[PDB]
Amino acid sequence: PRTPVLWLHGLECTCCSESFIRSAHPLAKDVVLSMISLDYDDTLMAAAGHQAEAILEEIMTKYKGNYILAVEGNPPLNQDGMSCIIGGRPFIEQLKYVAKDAKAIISWGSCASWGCVQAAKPNPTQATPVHKVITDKPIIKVPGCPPIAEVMTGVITYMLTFDRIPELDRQGRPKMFYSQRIHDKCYRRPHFDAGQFVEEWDDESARKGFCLYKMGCKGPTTYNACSTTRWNEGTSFPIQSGHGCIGCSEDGFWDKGSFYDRLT
Amino acid sequence: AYATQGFNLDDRGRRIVVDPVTRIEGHMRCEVNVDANNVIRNAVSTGTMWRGLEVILKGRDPRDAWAFVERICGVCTGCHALASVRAVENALDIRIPKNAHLIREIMAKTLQVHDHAVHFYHLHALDWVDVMSALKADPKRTSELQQLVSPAHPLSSAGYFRDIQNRLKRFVESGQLGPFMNGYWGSKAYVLPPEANLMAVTHYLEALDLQKEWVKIHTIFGGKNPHPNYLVGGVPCAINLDGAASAPVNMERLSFVKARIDEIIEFNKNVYVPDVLAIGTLYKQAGWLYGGGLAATNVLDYGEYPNVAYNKSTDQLPGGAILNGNWDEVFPVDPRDSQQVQEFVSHSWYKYADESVGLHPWDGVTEPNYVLGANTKGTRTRIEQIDESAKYSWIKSPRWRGHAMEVGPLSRYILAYAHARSGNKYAERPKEQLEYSAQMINSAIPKALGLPETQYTLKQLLPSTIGRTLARALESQYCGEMMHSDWHDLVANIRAGDTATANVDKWDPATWPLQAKGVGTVAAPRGALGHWIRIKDGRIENYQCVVPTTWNGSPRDYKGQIGAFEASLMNTPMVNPEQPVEILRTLHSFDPCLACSTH
Numbered sequence: 001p002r003t004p005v006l007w008l009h010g011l012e013c014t015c016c017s018e019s020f021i022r023s024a025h026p027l028a029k030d031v032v033l034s035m036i037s038l039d040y041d042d043t044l045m046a047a048a049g050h051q052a053e054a055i056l057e058e059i060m061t062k063y064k065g066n067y068i069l070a071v072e073g074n075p076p077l078n079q080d081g082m083s084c085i086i087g088g089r090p091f092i093e094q095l096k097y098v099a100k101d102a103k104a105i106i107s108w109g110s111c112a113s114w115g116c117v118q119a120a121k122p123n124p125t126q127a128t129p130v131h132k133v134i135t136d137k138p139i140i141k142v143p144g145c146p147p148i149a150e151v152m153t154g155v156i157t158y159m160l161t162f163d164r165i166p167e168l169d170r171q172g173r174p175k176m177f178y179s180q181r182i183h184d185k186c187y188r189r190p191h192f193d194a195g196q197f198v199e200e201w202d203d204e205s206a207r208k209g210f211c212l213y214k215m216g217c218k219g220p221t222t223y224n225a226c227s228t229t230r231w232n233e234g235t236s237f238p239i240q241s242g243h244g245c246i247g248c249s250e251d252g253f254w255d256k257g258s259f260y261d262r263l264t
Numbered sequence: 265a266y267a268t269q270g271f272n273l274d275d276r277g278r279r280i281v282v283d284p285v286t287r288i289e290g291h292m293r294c295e296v297n298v299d300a301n302n303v304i305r306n307a308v309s310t311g312t313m314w315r316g317l318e319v320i321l322k323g324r325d326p327r328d329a330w331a332f333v334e335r336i337c338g339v340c341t342g343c344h345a346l347a348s349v350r351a352v353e354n355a356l357d358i359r360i361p362k363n364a365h366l367i368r369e370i371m372a373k374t375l376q377v378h379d380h381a382v383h384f385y386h387l388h389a390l391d392w393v394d395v396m397s398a399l400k401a402d403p404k405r406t407s408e409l410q411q412l413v414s415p416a417h418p419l420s421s422a423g424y425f426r427d428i429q430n431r432l433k434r435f436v437e438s439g440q441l442g443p444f445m446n447g448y449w450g451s452k453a454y455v456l457p458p459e460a461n462l463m464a465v466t467h468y469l470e471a472l473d474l475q476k477e478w479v480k481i482h483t484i485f486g487g488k489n490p491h492p493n494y495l496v497g498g499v500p501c502a503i504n505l506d507g508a509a510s511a512p513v514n515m516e517r518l519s520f521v522k523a524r525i526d527e528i529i530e531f532n533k534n535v536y537v538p539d540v541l542a543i544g545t546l547y548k549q550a551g552w553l554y555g556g557g558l559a560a561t562n563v564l565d566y567g568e569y570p571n572v573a574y575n576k577s578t579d580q581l582p583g584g585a586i587l588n589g590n591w592d593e594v595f596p597v598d599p600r601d602s603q604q605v606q607e608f609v610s611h612s613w614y615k616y617a618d619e620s621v622g623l624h625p626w627d628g629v630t631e632p633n634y635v636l637g638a639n640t641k642g643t644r645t646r647i648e649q650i651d652e653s654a655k656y657s658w659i660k661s662p663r664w665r666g667h668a669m670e671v672g673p674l675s676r677y678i679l680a681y682a683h684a685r686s687g688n689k690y691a692e693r694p695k696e697q698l699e700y701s702a703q704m705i706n707s708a709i710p711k712a713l714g715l716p717e718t719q720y721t722l723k724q725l726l727p728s729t730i731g732r733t734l735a736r737a738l739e740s741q742y743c744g745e746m747m748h749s750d751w752h753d754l755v756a757n758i759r760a761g762d763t764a765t766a767n768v769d770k771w772d773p774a775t776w777p778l779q780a781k782g783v784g785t786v787a788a789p790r791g792a793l794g795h796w797i798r799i800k801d802g803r804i805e806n807y808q809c810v811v812p813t814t815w816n817g818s819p820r821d822y823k824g825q826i827g828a829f830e831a832s833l834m835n836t837p838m839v840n841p842e843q844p845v846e847i848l849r850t851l852h853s854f855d856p857c858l859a860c861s862t863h
């Protein structure tokens with residue numbers, strides 16, 4: 001039998017779900033048909049309303065302590081939790097209920113991992129990352145807005161193959177994908193090392209692919225696989241396409257000043 | 265119980281709740297009342313999420329705004345970034361170079377195709393297709409059906425369909441149905457024959473594999489998908505032909521983009537449009553013409569895709585507003601006019617000083633006020649039945665000159681048709697698509713399948729859930745065709761010697777006026793999108809978004825007028841009031857994006 005996954009959605013934009021289905025190796029089709037049993041997921045599931053709700057109970061009972069809880073988005077604590085309502089109740093109540101009997105919890109994306117855009121100042125909903133609400137369960141953070149598709153499916157693949165969470169760094173991220181800063185292997189690094197920088201958009205330096213540090217690139221302080229694995233089956237990444245990294249896999253990246261202000 | 269917009273609302277019948285509404289983006293609750301014969305006589309749209317992006321933007325740099333608002337939605341990814349950079353450029357009087365214009369258009373049209381096709385197959389199709397019936401299908405007859413529906417589609421053999429059916433069989437026989445668990449399979453609301461169901465399941469799988477290729481266009485120009493990067497003043501993807509993977513865009517990268525565009529054109533022409541025409545024909549034959557709602561009277565779009573940049577008379581999806589079902593009169597729509605686009609919060613979880621008025625978004629206010637009405641069944645944190653006489657949604661209520669409007673591909677196609685009939689030549693292609701579609705649905709497909717021919721007019725066919733679904737597919741096709749043209753224009757311009765991608769003359773805030781206001785509009789996948797910004801001393805003073813699903817999913821206004829979702833469910837019979845098949849089918853035809861609607 002295939003390991004059940006209950007994929008919950010809090011406050012989110014749904015980018016992590018979309019990224020997941022971009023995976024080329026493995027294909028999302030093959031993940032859903034042959035690797036996991038995606039038993040609850042608002043995005044794709046046939047059942048709605050009472051019929052959808054009924055699935056959660058059935059799976060938690062039959063596979064107690066043997067399903068994976070994946071969480072996209074996050075719970076709000078303001079508005080009595082009713083800035084995110086599911087089945088007439090606060091999302092945080094659903095999150096806690098489903099988290100109780102999970103074998104493992106995946107915090108997909110910067111929303112679930114850290115808070116992302118809704119948690120940027122002044123955080124009107126008091127959106128709170130999963131690990132600050134669920135404090136007694138094994139959690140893996142897979143940050144990024146969204147994370148790279150193959151990083152997401154890479155995490156699933158590891159967990160299914162080994163029935164273990166991969167080795168994590170101090171912030172709870174998988175070392176197999178988040179051990180390097182973008183700046184370590186960024187192909188524009190020789191330009192950085194030679195003091196060759198873009199100073200204005202579409203200047204001669206930009207047309208020669210000079211380093212984006214002075215245009216605000218946050219690659220030197222951001223851990224992700226973007227410079228090596230790259231995006232959408234290794235087609236490009238933000239820097240290759242000409243925009244600096246905005247730090248999207250790092251905790252609180254929206255409140256670290258303008259994206260176009262250089263690091264000091 | 266009261267009458268509005270020709271609808272007789274009545275909440276005395278049986279109350280049905282659908283929470284969560286699934287196969288949408290984000291969070292929605294729907295309630296209806298049905299009469300003694302299971303006909304919907306009342307409908308209530310509740311947006312069940314809010315994040316407060318408008319509040320978060322205050323005090324930040326206008327040049328950063330696009331990245332924040334892009335995260336309103338990862339499904340319609342990039343359309344908010346486009347609206348934002350357009351709004352800032354409008355505020356600061358910045359004209360972008362031709363290549364930046366064309367690249368943004370290509371990215372926009374790529375989003376349209378991706379969003380539309382994924383919506384139809386992965387979110388909508390299960391409302392029309394019984395996947396368990398596909399197990400009963402004969403692969404030879406499925407092959408024969410495929411060849412009739414789309415003779416040019418190369419994946420048509422009996423063996424291919426047999427393989428797909430066998431994988432579905434093994435999946436179902438595992439006892440782990442996953443996304444098909446507790447579905448409504450076998451309901452009399454499903455009318456397709458087994459062969460049609462198997463064909464659709466096959467294409468669901470094909471589309472799931474192909475959709476990841478289309479977005480590589482975003483990846484080339486914007487670095488990543490979801491959430492490609494944008495730029496105030498142009499695009500970041502600098503051009504250099506001679507540059508050999510030294511610049512973001514060289515000729516090899518452009519050739520790659522063209523290959524992806526050509527694939528998109530084949531998919532729309534051979535898979536998506538023919539499937540929708542065929543499924544639409546069969547549901548038409550069953551008499552399922554419900555769901556017209558406001559499309560029968562009031563439709564709006566800002567107008568988009570000008571042949572000549574900054575020349576709105578050349579819009580290839582020309583916009584405006586139609587009222588009262590009068591397709592002979594298109595009113596111009598001006599996003600700058602304070603008396604046109606306004607948002608009410610009378611029945612929304614927000615507060616205004618005076619909630620008897622609607623605010624134009626340059627004067628917009630977003631102060632949360634989560635409070636439930638006196639007739640609520642349940643508590644503040646455990647709602648059993650929501651009270652729609654009071655505040656019942658995180659979605660504001662946008663209106664145009666006080667009128668409730670439907671937005672979306674259907675609205676754009678009705679407008680295009682109206683424009684084309686008035687002599688607008690830029691709308692000729694959508695008109696051709698509609699006339700072709702009507703002939704297929706009425707005559708060609710019935711004749712091919714041995715069904716009676718019908719004589720429905722576009723006036724009759726279009727304002728319906730079938731029509732709404734069809735318009736989306738046609739729009740996808742048109743967008744693929746347009747971006748093919750845009751690609752040629754881009755390459756020609758670069759080869760002529762114009763490699764500029766950004767205007768940086770007003771990049772530095774020291775060059776800005778100390779106060780400014782701007783608006784950016786986009787024909788987003790789900791309809792009319794606008795961002796309205798006020799800038800003061802280099803910072804965002806106000807930032808207000810009015811998003812397509814805000815229009816369509818809106819709760820009632822101060823006058824009690826209903827929005828598009830609520831109107832669309834009215835007067836629809838349900839086979840079984842405890843199985844929301846018809847509710848889902850019609851709601852899904854709007855492609856609701858709830859994160860978008862609430863932001």
Ligand code: SF4
Pocket residue numbers: 182183184186187188189190192210211212213217218219220239244245
């Ligand atoms: S572009 Fe960014 S990540 Fe790459 S070398 Fe320069 S600063 Fe480092």
Ligand code: F3S
Pocket residue numbers: 144145182222223224226237238239244245246247248249488
């Ligand atoms: S913005 Fe995000 S996608 Fe990668 S290059 Fe930077 S971590």
Ligand SMILES: [Cl-]
Pocket residue numbers: 110114115116117119250251252253254
């Ligand atoms: Cl964050």
Ligand SMILES: [Cl-]
Pocket residue numbers: 350365368
């Ligand atoms: Cl533009």
Ligand SMILES: [Kr]
Pocket residue numbers: 005007036070156
């Ligand atoms: Kr998953």
Ligand SMILES: [Kr]
Pocket residue numbers: 017018020021041043
């Ligand atoms: Kr997914």
Ligand SMILES: [Kr]
Pocket residue numbers: 017018021043
């Ligand atoms: Kr998705």
Ligand SMILES: [Kr]
Pocket residue numbers: 021028029032472
């Ligand atoms: Kr999937």
Ligand SMILES: [Kr]
Pocket residue numbers: 028029032033472
């Ligand atoms: Kr699938």
Ligand SMILES: [Kr]
Pocket residue numbers: 103104159163164165
């Ligand atoms: Kr695990």
Ligand SMILES: [Kr]
Pocket residue numbers: 294295307308309310829830833
């Ligand atoms: Kr509704």
Ligand SMILES: [Kr]
Pocket residue numbers: 043288289339382387
């Ligand atoms: Kr989606």
Ligand SMILES: [Kr]
Pocket residue numbers: 412413542709712713
């Ligand atoms: Kr057909």
Ligand SMILES: [Kr]
Pocket residue numbers: 033428431432435
């Ligand atoms: Kr399948």
Ligand SMILES: [Kr]
Pocket residue numbers: 032442443444
């Ligand atoms: Kr599936």
Ligand SMILES: [Kr]
Pocket residue numbers: 385389390393464465468
């Ligand atoms: Kr399907």
